[PDB]
Amino acid sequence: MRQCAIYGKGGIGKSTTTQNLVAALAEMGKKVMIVGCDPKADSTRLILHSKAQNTIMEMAAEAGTVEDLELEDVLKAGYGGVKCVESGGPEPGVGCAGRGVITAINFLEEEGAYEDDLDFVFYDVLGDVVCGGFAMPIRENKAQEIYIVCSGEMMAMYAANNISKGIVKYANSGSVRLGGLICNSRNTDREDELIIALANKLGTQMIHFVPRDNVVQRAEIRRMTVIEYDPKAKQADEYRALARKVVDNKLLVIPNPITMDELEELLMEFGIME
Amino acid sequence: AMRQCAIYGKGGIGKSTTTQNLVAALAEMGKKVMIVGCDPKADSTRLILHSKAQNTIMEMAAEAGTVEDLELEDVLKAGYGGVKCVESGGPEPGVGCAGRGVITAINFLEEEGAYEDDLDFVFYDVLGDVVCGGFAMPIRENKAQEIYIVCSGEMMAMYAANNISKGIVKYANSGSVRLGGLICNSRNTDREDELIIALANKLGTQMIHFVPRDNVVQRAEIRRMTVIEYDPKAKQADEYRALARKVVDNKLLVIPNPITMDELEELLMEFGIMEVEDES
Amino acid sequence: ATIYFSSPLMPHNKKVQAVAGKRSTLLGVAQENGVKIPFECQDGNCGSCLVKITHLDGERIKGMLLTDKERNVLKSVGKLPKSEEERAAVRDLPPTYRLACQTIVTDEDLLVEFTGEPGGA
Amino acid sequence: ATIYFSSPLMPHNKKVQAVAGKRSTKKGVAQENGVKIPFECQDGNCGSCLVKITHLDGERIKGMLLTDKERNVLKSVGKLPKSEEERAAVRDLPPTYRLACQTIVTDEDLLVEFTGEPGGA
Amino acid sequence: MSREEVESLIQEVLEVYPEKARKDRNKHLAVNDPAVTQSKKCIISNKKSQPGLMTIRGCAYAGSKGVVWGPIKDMIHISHGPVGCGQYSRAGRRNYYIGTTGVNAFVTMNFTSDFQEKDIVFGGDKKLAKLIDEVETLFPLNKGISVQSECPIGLIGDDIESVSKVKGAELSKTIVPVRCEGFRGVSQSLGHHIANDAVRDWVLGKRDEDTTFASTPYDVAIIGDYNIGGDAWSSRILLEEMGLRCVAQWSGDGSISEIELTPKVKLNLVHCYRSMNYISRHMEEKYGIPWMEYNFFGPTKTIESLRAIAAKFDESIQKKCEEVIAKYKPEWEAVVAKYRPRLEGKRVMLYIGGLRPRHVIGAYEDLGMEVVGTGYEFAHNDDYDRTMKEMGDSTLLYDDVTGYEFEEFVKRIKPDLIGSGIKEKFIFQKMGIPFREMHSWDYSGPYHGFDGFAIFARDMDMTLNNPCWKKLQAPWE
Amino acid sequence: SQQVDKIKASYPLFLDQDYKDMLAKKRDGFEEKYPQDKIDEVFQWTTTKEYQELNFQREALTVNPAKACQPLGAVLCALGFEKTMPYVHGSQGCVAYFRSYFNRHFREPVSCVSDSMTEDAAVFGGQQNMKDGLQNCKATYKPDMIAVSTTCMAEVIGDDLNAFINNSKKEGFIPDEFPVPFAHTPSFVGSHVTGWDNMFEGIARYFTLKSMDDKVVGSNKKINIVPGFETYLGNFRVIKRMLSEMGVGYSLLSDPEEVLDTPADGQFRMYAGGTTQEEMKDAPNALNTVLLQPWHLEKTKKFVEGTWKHEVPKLNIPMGLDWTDEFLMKVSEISGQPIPASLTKERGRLVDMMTDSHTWLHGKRFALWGDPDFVMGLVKFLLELGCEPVHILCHNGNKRWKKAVDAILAASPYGKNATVYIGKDLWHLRSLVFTDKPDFMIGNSYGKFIQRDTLHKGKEFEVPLIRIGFPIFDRHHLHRSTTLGYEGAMQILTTLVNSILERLDEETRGMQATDYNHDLVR
Numbered sequence A: 001m002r003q004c005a006i007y008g009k010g011g012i013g014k015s016t017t018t019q020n021l022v023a024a025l026a027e028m029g030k031k032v033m034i035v036g037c038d039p040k041a042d043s044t045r046l047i048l049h050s051k052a053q054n055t056i057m058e059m060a061a062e063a064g065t066v067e068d069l070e071l072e073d074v075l076k077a078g079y080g081g082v083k084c085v086e087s088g089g090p091e092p093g094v095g096c097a098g099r100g101v102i103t104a105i106n107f108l109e110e111e112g113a114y115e116d117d118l119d120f121v122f123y124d125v126l127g128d129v130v131c132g133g134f135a136m137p138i139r140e141n142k143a144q145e146i147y148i149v150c151s152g153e154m155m156a157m158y159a160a161n162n163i164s165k166g167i168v169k170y171a172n173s174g175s176v177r178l179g180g181l182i183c184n185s186r187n188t189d190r191e192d193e194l195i196i197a198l199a200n201k202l203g204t205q206m207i208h209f210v211p212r213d214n215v216v217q218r219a220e221i222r223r224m225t226v227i228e229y230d231p232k233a234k235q236a237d238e239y240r241a242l243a244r245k246v247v248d249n250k251l252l253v254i255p256n257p258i259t260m261d262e263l264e265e266l267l268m269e270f271g272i273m274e
Numbered sequence B: 001a002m003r004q005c006a007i008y009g010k011g012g013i014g015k016s017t018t019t020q021n022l023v024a025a026l027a028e029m030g031k032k033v034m035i036v037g038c039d040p041k042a043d044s045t046r047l048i049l050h051s052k053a054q055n056t057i058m059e060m061a062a063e064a065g066t067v068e069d070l071e072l073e074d075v076l077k078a079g080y081g082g083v084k085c086v087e088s089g090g091p092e093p094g095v096g097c098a099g100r101g102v103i104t105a106i107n108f109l110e111e112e113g114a115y116e117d118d119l120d121f122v123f124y125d126v127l128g129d130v131v132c133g134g135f136a137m138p139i140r141e142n143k144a145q146e147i148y149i150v151c152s153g154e155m156m157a158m159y160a161a162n163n164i165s166k167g168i169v170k171y172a173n174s175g176s177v178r179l180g181g182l183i184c185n186s187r188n189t190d191r192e193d194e195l196i197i198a199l200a201n202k203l204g205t206q207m208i209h210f211v212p213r214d215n216v217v218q219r220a221e222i223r224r225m226t227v228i229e230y231d232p233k234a235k236q237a238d239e240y241r242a243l244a245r246k247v248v249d250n251k252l253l254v255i256p257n258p259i260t261m262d263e264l265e266e267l268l269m270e271f272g273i274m275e276v277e278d279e280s
Numbered sequence C: 001a002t003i004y005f006s007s008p009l010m011p012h013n014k015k016v017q018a019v020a021g022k023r024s025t026l027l028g029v030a031q032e033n034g035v036k037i038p039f040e041c042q043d044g045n046c047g048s049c050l051v052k053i054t055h056l057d058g059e060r061i062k063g064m065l066l067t068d069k070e071r072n073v074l075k076s077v078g079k080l081p082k083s084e085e086e087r088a089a090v091r092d093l094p095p096t097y098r099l100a101c102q103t104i105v106t107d108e109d110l111l112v113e114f115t116g117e118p119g120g121a
Numbered sequence D: 001a002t003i004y005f006s007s008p009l010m011p012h013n014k015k016v017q018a019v020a021g022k023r024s025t026k027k028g029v030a031q032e033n034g035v036k037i038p039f040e041c042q043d044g045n046c047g048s049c050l051v052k053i054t055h056l057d058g059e060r061i062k063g064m065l066l067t068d069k070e071r072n073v074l075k076s077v078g079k080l081p082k083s084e085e086e087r088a089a090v091r092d093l094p095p096t097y098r099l100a101c102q103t104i105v106t107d108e109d110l111l112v113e114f115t116g117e118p119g120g121a
Numbered sequence E: 001m002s003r004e005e006v007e008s009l010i011q012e013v014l015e016v017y018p019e020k021a022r023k024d025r026n027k028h029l030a031v032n033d034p035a036v037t038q039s040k041k042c043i044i045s046n047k048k049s050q051p052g053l054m055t056i057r058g059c060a061y062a063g064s065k066g067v068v069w070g071p072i073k074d075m076i077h078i079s080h081g082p083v084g085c086g087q088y089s090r091a092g093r094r095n096y097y098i099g100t101t102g103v104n105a106f107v108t109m110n111f112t113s114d115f116q117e118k119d120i121v122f123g124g125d126k127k128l129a130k131l132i133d134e135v136e137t138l139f140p141l142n143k144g145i146s147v148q149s150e151c152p153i154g155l156i157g158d159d160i161e162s163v164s165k166v167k168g169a170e171l172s173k174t175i176v177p178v179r180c181e182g183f184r185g186v187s188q189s190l191g192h193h194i195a196n197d198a199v200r201d202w203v204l205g206k207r208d209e210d211t212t213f214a215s216t217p218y219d220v221a222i223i224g225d226y227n228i229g230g231d232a233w234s235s236r237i238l239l240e241e242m243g244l245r246c247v248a249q250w251s252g253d254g255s256i257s258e259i260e261l262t263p264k265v266k267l268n269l270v271h272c273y274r275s276m277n278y279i280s281r282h283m284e285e286k287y288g289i290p291w292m293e294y295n296f297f298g299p300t301k302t303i304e305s306l307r308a309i310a311a312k313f314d315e316s317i318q319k320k321c322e323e324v325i326a327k328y329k330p331e332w333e334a335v336v337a338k339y340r341p342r343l344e345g346k347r348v349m350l351y352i353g354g355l356r357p358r359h360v361i362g363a364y365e366d367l368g369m370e371v372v373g374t375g376y377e378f379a380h381n382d383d384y385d386r387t388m389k390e391m392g393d394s395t396l397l398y399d400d401v402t403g404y405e406f407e408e409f410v411k412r413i414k415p416d417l418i419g420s421g422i423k424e425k426f427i428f429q430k431m432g433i434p435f436r437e438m439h440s441w442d443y444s445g446p447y448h449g450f451d452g453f454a455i456f457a458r459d460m461d462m463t464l465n466n467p468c469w470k471k472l473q474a475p476w477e
Numbered sequence F: 001s002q003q004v005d006k007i008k009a010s011y012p013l014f015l016d017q018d019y020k021d022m023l024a025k026k027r028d029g030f031e032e033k034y035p036q037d038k039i040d041e042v043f044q045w046t047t048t049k050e051y052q053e054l055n056f057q058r059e060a061l062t063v064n065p066a067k068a069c070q071p072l073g074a075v076l077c078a079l080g081f082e083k084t085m086p087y088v089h090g091s092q093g094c095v096a097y098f099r100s101y102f103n104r105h106f107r108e109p110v111s112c113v114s115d116s117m118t119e120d121a122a123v124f125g126g127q128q129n130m131k132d133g134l135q136n137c138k139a140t141y142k143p144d145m146i147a148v149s150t151t152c153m154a155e156v157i158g159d160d161l162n163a164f165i166n167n168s169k170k171e172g173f174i175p176d177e178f179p180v181p182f183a184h185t186p187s188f189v190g191s192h193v194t195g196w197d198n199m200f201e202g203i204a205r206y207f208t209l210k211s212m213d214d215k216v217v218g219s220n221k222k223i224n225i226v227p228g229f230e231t232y233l234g235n236f237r238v239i240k241r242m243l244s245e246m247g248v249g250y251s252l253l254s255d256p257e258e259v260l261d262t263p264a265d266g267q268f269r270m271y272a273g274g275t276t277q278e279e280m281k282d283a284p285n286a287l288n289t290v291l292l293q294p295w296h297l298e299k300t301k302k303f304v305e306g307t308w309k310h311e312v313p314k315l316n317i318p319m320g321l322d323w324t325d326e327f328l329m330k331v332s333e334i335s336g337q338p339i340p341a342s343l344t345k346e347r348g349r350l351v352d353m354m355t356d357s358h359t360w361l362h363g364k365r366f367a368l369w370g371d372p373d374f375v376m377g378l379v380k381f382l383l384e385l386g387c388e389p390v391h392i393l394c395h396n397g398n399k400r401w402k403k404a405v406d407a408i409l410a411a412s413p414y415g416k417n418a419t420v421y422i423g424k425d426l427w428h429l430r431s432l433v434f435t436d437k438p439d440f441m442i443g444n445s446y447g448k449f450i451q452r453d454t455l456h457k458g459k460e461f462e463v464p465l466i467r468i469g470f471p472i473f474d475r476h477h478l479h480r481s482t483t484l485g486y487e488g489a490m491q492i493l494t495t496l497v498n499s500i501l502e503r504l505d506e507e508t509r510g511m512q513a514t515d516y517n518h519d520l521v522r
């Protein structure tokens, strides 16, 4: 009954990495569930194969209110083991955009969707800003383990720093801790050892380094995970390796935030920024 | 008739064990009494309910919305013949005043009406280490009519007894709070019975029954019961009863005369506890 | 009815006189007096007008109706404890946090606090 | 002058009418109306009567004198920031936290908050 | 019996509804388990009615003007707004009073603003002040004015509070503004709350600084008895025979001075918890007056309540209570001996808005009758907490029942008697089922006390064992 | 204390000595009642003429009105159509009060629903209430038609019915072909009869506005009958009988007489009878349309004249002798059917009764209040009987109606005493009957208090009440009486003459004091 959350800047493959991770865990006799906290509801499409899963926020407004909402209408097991929920979000400019996460997470506890057969619960959470309902996993102690999906680019390392700052603030209130870093590779030089440098200074560990591949592009058209498409793919074994280290990861640390210069100096030495 | 009592003293000297044993004796004489635990650690009702550390008002008010929503029956339990038991509890260490629970619990008991007419005694067990804050509130707000200070032969317990008597005299004009006596709990140290007698004479008050140490107290504590119930035929059971009769028959409620720190030092050397001190 | 508006965005707390029970809500009184509570919807679902309301005259607290729409929005924002929900359902007593666009002014003295942020932090 | 007392120990906020400028301080107003602010000295040197004052009519804020005795006590309980000390010295405007036994009632509307604990937590 | 049968009946009844209506109405029907202490997990109450389902509930104006404020006899109550609201509630509730109507009592009269279009467009505050002036010259002996607002008053944004303050200061008169617009609240319960708040804020605290009233250690105040057919007078004679002095009566046959004298009284006896628990709690918190709930329906409940009340005083009151019980014992013994054999074993279903279904269950059981169904239009969850103990196991419980639901439940259960209001009486009489009006007592009563128990037994026997119920079917058919 | 053999209800149980002592103690101790002499002085003051000038002066305060609000009439009109549910858009208290009012008058079930609009709708409007209520009512009570009215809350909000119902149909809450006629019935305009008129016009316009192309006047050879706000079942029955005895094809539009009188046979019928949708659709094909109560059917008259192209005759309410004669004459002229001998014999019997009762009736003073058409018909009949209507009150009458009634009173020597009051309530009438005492009152149950007041001044000032009108609450089954036609005229005559004779019998009953006039034969 370990619940984890995936935090990172938008566009860093976090939704796909969570889905291929989940597909990698479904085969090995584990029943897991994905909760999509990203406002755009593309975080369960490879599992469900659906064009666009109806979000809890969407169907609550059409059905009057969230009380008139049934769990069997929001929770779809497109894959038999995998359970997929899309929280959804409000329209831009209308209230707090993270309030969709609060409604969905509260709804799932109310209906008891966390009962007796879940091994892992994964939250795919927007990481550009940590506030409102996006900081809700860390603030409410919903997700004990947190993995950050980062990149060589400076904004991704800056995003990883902000999440660690928010984990420190709620370290005393809750058991939530940084479980590790996930480095998703664009075809740039000196990346894996760059993020290892980041992790070594944060007091946390790197978990894996997933490289860019073209097998994922074939999977996109299928609306399927790479694992279910081509289980013999080099990327598909890479995702098994990342999955196996997630289950057998034991150290969970309170992060150490990194200042502006100190993060900057790491970029200059590797040459990513001049 | 509504005789409200309080027991003060240094932490770890045996206030809770003396209070619960005293209260058990009082119920044996058909006296309806209530214990209010004002100690932050909240273990002053273990040996009456026999269950565990009683749920405190701070915990119940926190899990519920607020204090008025909390039920009287939820925090005020009945044990040992129905002697009512309540625990004030305390806030998180380093947050607010460590005596805030005392201020909260006494207000809740008054608002509900738990101070019903057919109660004879109400005992408050409060840590005396510091007088200030919610630990002075029973004295300041006239909550406890008479005070008994548990004290031993140690320097700290004697110093804490003088501090509590300082609090009483400050609030003596504004209320009926008075000093009832001193209870000497024994560490088996030599020449302590007369030491506490001397301190009581210096303070101007009597001395309540002196309690020798024994391992029968721990025997009843490991089973979570008062010594008087665990053995009614033991000498400690009658000794606790003797302390309770003198409490009911107590009538010398005086305004103490706090003594100076150097006087405490001088009176400690005359009994051999402190070695004689020479400046050179 | 006397209403005191308070906000860190406001240099000074503002005191206004309001007619109780108007079809126009607390949002009406605020807009007429230039109090900048963020209003971002016309259907009462966004929750951006969340305010903290204190009844200064505790003896003069008026029973009201907490509608199902306001209640659900307060849960979605998170500003509704289970005890306050039970208090409203059983005793018809207002919760601490309200939506200004759905709050009817009563005949009492009120302190209204807002941060300038939408409900839900 | 209208004074609203507020405390977690009080079930309801109490509203009182007071005469401004009396030699008897806010401590006087509280004691006539049975408000249990802890008063544990007669020389104004303890911090027990520390209260938080909010001027509800922010336009009707009266200039006053922060006495050197009250200033030092507020600093001894860590309740006088340097910016508020400078504002009192230069603009003669009251600080957020006050000592009730040393606070003179002015002709405005005030919200007085206390916890039941002495100043200094 | 037949708990599973009751559950299946509820399920098959709920099938006609759309999904929203079915889902909501499922929360409001329950099978009684007397072992439950918290009703809210078992059943839900105090919610909005489903649109277009023929609810029996009223509005807040009915709960305030028609229930709480109306019985007060020496005050003049103005129905502020159009004419319908005042017209339909005029003398429709039997709250008994002693006075000369139109001179010093005004209970059965309809004072209204009679709003027109220009009143809606421009407002009615000046009209309200003019009306207040007109009332004082026309009726110089009135001792106070209340302004019960109807829907357009709050809908157009009138300031009745400032008008009340100005006119009361000018004329040295008590003018109480009540914002009891019908759209506020889901039923009459919020009307009760608003009326209690108005009483607390404009009436109760007037004789606070005076002490000319000579009090007594035996002073009580009846709270929440509206003298329906004279119930409060029977309760009062029973209390005064016990040795107590009744200072106030809320609000049947009530006066403004009796309301103002309620702070002096030592104890509050609250017959109805739902309508007047608010003011009782306020008085307990402010003046330190304790309060208790009593029941004067049937001999058993009456004796129990009398003993409980006597337990709050000295031993002379208890001796007088025993004297009263001994004096009244043979009367209700004779009543039971006459009427129980005719009524033994009959099954009755009830549907009254708050307190009364639970309140009359004991009186029915005193005659060998058993209540298969108990139901409330507006009760809260505390009322259901109180009523679950008093109802038998596997009995039906309903909240805000619709007409369709009640008709189907009655068709399946087939009780021998139904007790409800005027809006169900002629529905259930055409089905051949005896019906007793449990709001107005079918223009009979009182039912409180032993004097009322006699009339209650006579009425139940009258209606249930009537020849006309065997004449319902044609002989050729 | 009760005796089990003779159990006493509130009267006269509270006349016992112990209860009297209890009430005296309560009044003396805690009521602070005014001195009884002061109360008597104030009562006598309220009797006098200076009080009447103050009472007449008031321009704002209304005391004991004699009218209701529009949605009551709208519900009554909607109840007269087959398998139709009255639906009031607004708060539920309105519907509860309407149902209680009609239940007390007719002693029959009354079916009506609301959408239970609350503070949520007060802020954001009631469109969702409309959609949910329409779907719920159609699913639950299965009507063939839903007629929508409004409360004062809806009108102040500005919620519009047409858009709400169209959005309900477009979004799938109700089928697009389901008939949902509607009308706006503000309670601050007019009275209940105005609401009846508005609802009838709404329904007629709903069914007969978009297909006027194939409508030919007189093609079905029938006469449309619009009764108006009518609370006497005998009036519907007598209109039907008079037209059926004359061989005249007719269509009674909005007749509720079946649902308001259903047999008790062990089952409950929510719907019974009523005007069919086919009759409403075929209404413009009729030869003409007659309005039984013209003075509260004005918008309906405008619609029927300007859309159905029917030359609506100028007829009064068929009350009394002359107006019943005129109604039968107009029906004969329109339908081409001669008046049969049965109607002539009935009219002759009415004249016989008038000549038999004339000596008692001649010169009796009557104070009457009611709806405009009913009041004017009653005044006409009183004039034809030789009686003097001295106080004529109509709370919901206008100046044109007052002019017509004054013209009616001018054409008879028995209307010299008569004066007409509009906008006045029953407190005004209490002042009128105190300062200018008539012999009798004619009105609804609300006059029973006025009689009470008069009896307090003395038996020689008592003005007995005669219960004709709406609503009658303290008597049973009087709603089955007929006011219209020769039958209604003779029922009214019997009531009047027997009330006079009963009053005389009561006055002359004292032994050795007045019983010299206690005649066996009268």
Ligand SMILES: Nc1ncnc2c1ncn2[C@@H]1O[C@H](COP(=O)(O)OP(=O)(O)O)[C@@H](O)[C@H]1O
Pocket (backbone or CB within 6 Å): A009, A010, A011, A012, A013, A014, A015, A016, A017, A042, A184, A210, A211, A212, A213, A214, A216, A217, A220
């Ligand atoms: N391990 C990977 N190897 C190659 N490409 C990837 C990998 N993970 C993600 N991508 C690509 O990166 C893009 C970002 O995907 P997505 O997760 O939807 O965005 P976000 O991270 O904002 O949720 C996708 O279009 C995907 O094709």
Ligand SMILES: Nc1ncnc2c1ncn2[C@@H]1O[C@H](COP(=O)(O)OP(=O)(O)O)[C@@H](O)[C@H]1O
Pocket (backbone or CB within 6 Å): B010, B011, B012, B013, B014, B015, B016, B017, B018, B211, B212, B213, B214, B215, B217, B218, B221
């Ligand atoms: N009369 C006694 N004889 C022997 N040991 C005792 C006696 N009273 C208390 N103790 C021991 O002293 C320890 C601390 O006493 P306690 O009552 O917890 O102190 P406090 O006054 O802080 O509550 C306990 O573990 C108990 O075993």
Ligand code: ICS
Pocket (backbone or CB within 6 Å): E063, E067, E093, E188, E226, E228, E272, E274, E275, E352, E353, E354, E355, E356, E357, E438, E439, E440
């Ligand atoms: S006031 Fe209430 S509906 Fe408590 S609105 Fe209603 S004369 Fe009922 S169950 Mo009519 S809360 Fe009284 C009542 Fe009970 S009018 Fe009477 S019978 S005991």
Ligand code: CLF
Pocket (backbone or CB within 6 Å): E059, E060, E061, E062, E082, E083, E084, E085, E086, E149, E150, E151, E180, E181, E182, E183, F069, F070, F071, F091, F092, F093, F094, F095, F097, F150, F151, F152, F153, F187
């Ligand atoms: S819910 Fe209540 S009873 Fe209803 S109106 Fe509103 S306050 Fe009144 Fe009176 S006038 Fe007629 S019946 Fe209504 S529609 Fe306008």
Ligand code: SF4
Pocket (backbone or CB within 6 Å): B096, B097, B098, B099, B130, B131, B132, B133, B134, B135, D118, D120, D121
């Ligand atoms: S007053 Fe005493 S108990 Fe309270 S915080 Fe200060 S030192 Fe601690």
Ligand code: FES
Pocket (backbone or CB within 6 Å): C038, C039, C040, C041, C042, C043, C044, C045, C046, C047, C048, C049, C073, C099, C100, C101, C102
């Ligand atoms: S403005 Fe959107 S909820 Fe109030």
Ligand code: FES
Pocket (backbone or CB within 6 Å): D038, D039, D040, D041, D042, D043, D044, D045, D046, D047, D048, D049, D099, D100, D101, D102
């Ligand atoms: S009471 Fe000590 S400073 Fe005020």
Ligand SMILES: [Fe+3]
Pocket (backbone or CB within 6 Å): E426, F106, F107, F108
């Ligand atoms: Fe009938």
Ligand SMILES: [Mg+2]
Pocket (backbone or CB within 6 Å): A015, A016, A038, A042, A043
């Ligand atoms: Mg994505």
Ligand SMILES: [Mg+2]
Pocket (backbone or CB within 6 Å): B015, B016, B039, B043, B044
């Ligand atoms: Mg201890």
